[PDB]
Amino acid sequence: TVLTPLTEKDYEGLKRVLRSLQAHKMAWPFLEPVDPNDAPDYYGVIKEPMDLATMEERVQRRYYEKLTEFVADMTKIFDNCRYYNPSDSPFYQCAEVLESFFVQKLKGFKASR
Ligand SMILES: C#CCNc1nccc(Nc2ccc3c(c2)N(C(=O)C2CC2)CCC3)n1
Numbered sequence: 001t002v003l004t005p006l007t008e009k010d011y012e013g014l015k016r017v018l019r020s021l022q023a024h025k026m027a028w029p030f031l032e033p034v035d036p037n038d039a040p041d042y043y044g045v046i047k048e049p050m051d052l053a054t055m056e057e058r059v060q061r062r063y064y065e066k067l068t069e070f071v072a073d074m075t076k077i078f079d080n081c082r083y084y085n086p087s088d089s090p091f092y093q094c095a096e097v098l099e100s101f102f103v104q105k106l107k108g109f110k111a112s113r
Helices: 008-023 025-030 052-060 067-084 090-111
Strands: none
Touching: 008 025, 008 052, 008 067, 008 090, 025 067, 025 090, 052 067, 067 090
16 A cells, blocks of 8 residues: 555655645744754654655655655654644644645645556
8 A cells, every 4th residue: 555665756756745845834844953942952852853854855865665654754743743832832733734735745646656
């Protein structure tokens, strides 16, 4: 299912999904690693940080062998955000918006495989 090996043509689809996420108006908090100057305790709280720039590096290097691994990294971004930030924080709302967008794009990618 979602465990099949990613082909080179799959990787063109993954690049497009990632670029759509990076261009979303609510993606700004996720574009780069969390700066500890903006959240001093963040890296003691979150033990597996993730961000869209790290995923872009991984896509360029063909890090992902299965689509599940790509979805797992994307899910970490949103899970870390909802765990670190309170439910009324604007950051929490950004994760809400961007995760539903990612699901919309992912369904598109899967249908096109
Ligand atoms: C605006 C601005 C500063 N510049 C910048 N640039 C690019 C991304 C970015 N993310 C950012 C900024 C502040 C904070 C965060 C992230 N945290 C998050 O948990 C967000 C879910 C990722 C932790 C605490 C507060 N910040």
